[PDB]
Structures are given as structure tokens and as C-alpha cells.
Design a protein around this ligand. Structure first.
Ligand code: 912
Length: 285
């Protein structure tokens, strides 16, 4: 990891705030825009290990679809992690604020980028455990990059992760991870299928208002999320295969990247849409 001197870093605007630090947009020393995450004085040993451990993991990766680490401030206080700045923020909020503004080809290209990042992580023997649109960041080229790395800090810090009867984001998590804490790249594939559904719906909340227990019951009884509106048949087929109960039947990320790359390269393949089941009937004479 590159150790950066505090005098090179200018915090300009709070992007996010937590109990033990904040995330800032800033500039790094031509000066370059960066994101800056701080850890405030009084942090515990576990907080320090978790905080610097995220930078340690990120520093092991070099991929277009994985957030890039610029460096850390660890010699001075407060400590800081400095990354590239993703101008459009978190993917879930981004899509909700840009409803209907993109082509199907653009949406599928977002998914291919996410899948390539996840293929890299899985091959590097890194299991994400919290893959969801809220943990994807988007830059001004519309490139989607996987973020939120670490060990126990990932699910502990996510408000969507709730204590079950483990602390897990139920609607995004594979059955074996909910049931007996088996997190693997194949449970990340389940999550990727949910991310596919998030992207094609412009950020709808998975399973809408069903409670967590209701979601688990529905999944166990064989129900799956219905097709989004205006969704290519191939894309719905792919997300359905990500949601196979039997872990070993799910595609690997290599398969997902391959299929998405072929669909993008033959873009007419995306014009065949899966049927959408309406909830409203509008009848006019
Ligand atoms: C991923 C990562 C790990 C460790 C340390 C750092 Cl510094 C980072 N980097 C980042 O968090 C970020 C990189 N680029 C970012 N861009 C960005 C820009 C604008 C908004 C957001 C964003 O998610 N902001 C808010 C969106 C507003 C809300 C919902 O009130 C809270 C979260 C993120 S955040």
C-alpha cells in the first residue's frame, strides 16, 4: 500500500457519515478527485484491523471493475483510506434517480462489468458476502465497480443485514448462507442474480414489501422474483439460473461473463423480451 502524506489530501464534501468516521469527496496531490474514508481517534484494535484490512484487501486487486485504492494514511491521525472517486455514487440510488433513462444494452453492459469484477474476485478466492446494487459504485463512464471489502466489517456495517433467528442481508443472500452460514462464490452468484433484477427494474426493492421471514418462506417453497418489465428473455433466464436451490447447479461467474459478453456482441439477441405478468388490468371499450 502507498502511504500518503496528509498534506496531499484535501477533504471537500461529506459523502457519507458513520459513528466512527466519514466518507469524503476530496482531492489528492495535477490534483485528482478521490474518495476519503476516515477512522476517528479512540478506535479499538478490532476497528483498526477491520479498517486497514479493507485497504489491505483492496490493495491486492487490480481490475477495471473493482474499486481502486490510491493509498492510506496510517502514520498520522485520523487514519484514512483513499480511493478513486466514483462520480455517480451507489448503483441502487443511481438507478432509482434515473428511472427509464438508459437503453437495455446499457443496463446489460452494467451487468457485464459487475460480473467481470465478481469473476475476478472469485478467481482470487475472495467471497464478497454482501453483493447488492448498494455496494456497486458507478463512474462517469457508466462503469460499475464492486466495492465494500473486508471480513466481519462487511455484514456488521450494512444496515440491510439483520440478525436472524447470523447478521445477513436476507433478500440478497443464498439459501445455504441463510440456513447454515455457507458463503462461497456460488452464494455470491445468487446475489448477482438479485443484482441483475435490481438493475433491470431500475432499483426496485427485491420482493417489495414481503418481510424477511416471508422472503425465506417463499424461496423455500420455490417462488422466485417475477420478470421485470422490458426484460430480455435471455437476461431473465440467466437470473433464474442464478437462483437454483442446489448450489452446484448455478452458473459460475465465468459462465455469466461469457453469456453476457455474447449477448452484448449480438445486441439483437436482447430484443426478445420475456413476458411481463401485469398486476393491473386496464380495460377500455
Ligand atoms: C469503496 C471504498 C472503500 C474504502 C474507502 C473508500 Cl474511500 C471507498 N470509496 C468510496 O466509498 C467511494 C468512492 N466513490 C464514491 N462516490 C460516491 C459519490 C457520491 C455518492 C456516494 C454515495 O454512496 N453516497 C451516499 C448517497 C447519499 C446517501 C444515501 O445519503 C449516503 C451514501 C458515493 S464513494
Amino acid at each position: 500500500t502507498t502511504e500518503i502524506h496528509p498534506s496531499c489530501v484535501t477533504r471537500q464534501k461529506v459523502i457519507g457519515a458513520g459513528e466512527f468516521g466519514e466518507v469524503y469527496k476530496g482531492m489528492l496531490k495535477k490534483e485528482v478527485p478521490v474518495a476519503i474514508k476516515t477512522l476517528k481517534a479512540g478506535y479499538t484494535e478490532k476497528q483498526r484491523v477491520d479498517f486497514l484490512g479493507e485497504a489491505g484487501i483492496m490493495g491486492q486487486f487490480s481490475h477495471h471493475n473493482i474499486i481502486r485504492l490510491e493509498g492510506v494514511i496510517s502514520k498520522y491521525k485520523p487514519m484514512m483510506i483513499i480511493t478513486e472517486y466514483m462520480e455517480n455514487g451507489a448503483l441502487d440510488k443511481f438507478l432509482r434517480e434515473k428511472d427509464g433513462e438508459f437503453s437495455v444494452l446499457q443496463l446489460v453492459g452494467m451487468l457485464r462489468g459487475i460480473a467481470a469484477g465478481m469473476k475476478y474476485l472469485a478467481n482470487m478466492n475472495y467471497v464478497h458476502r454482501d453483493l447488492a446494487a448498494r455496494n456497486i459504485l458507478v463512474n462517469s463512464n457508466l462503469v460499475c465497480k464492486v466495492s465494500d471489502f473486508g471480513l466481519s466489517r462487511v455484514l456488521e456495517d450494512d444496515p440491510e443485514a439483520t440478525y436472524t433467528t447470523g447478521k445477513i442481508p436476507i433478500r440478497w443472500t443464498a439459501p445455504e448462507a441463510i440456513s447454515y452460514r455457507k458463503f462461497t462464490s456460488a452464494s455470491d452468484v445468487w446475489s448477482f442474480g438479485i443484482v441483475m433484477w435490481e438493475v433491470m427494474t431500475y432499483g426496485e426493492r427485491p420482493y417489495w414489501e414481503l418481510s424477511n421471514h416471508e422472503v425465506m418462506k417463499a424461496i423455500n417453497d420455490g417462488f422466485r422474483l417475477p420478470t421485470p418489465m422490458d426484460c430480455p428473455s435471455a437476461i431473465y433466464q440467466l437470473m433464474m439460473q442464478c437462483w437454483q436451490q442446489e448450489r452446484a447447479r448455478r452458473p459460475k461467474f465465468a459462465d455469466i461473463v461469457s453469456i453476457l459478453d455474447k449477448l452484448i456482441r449480438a445486441p439483437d439477441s436482447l430484443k426478445t423480451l420475456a413476458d411481463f405478468d401485469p398486476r393491473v388490468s386496464i380495460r377500455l371499450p
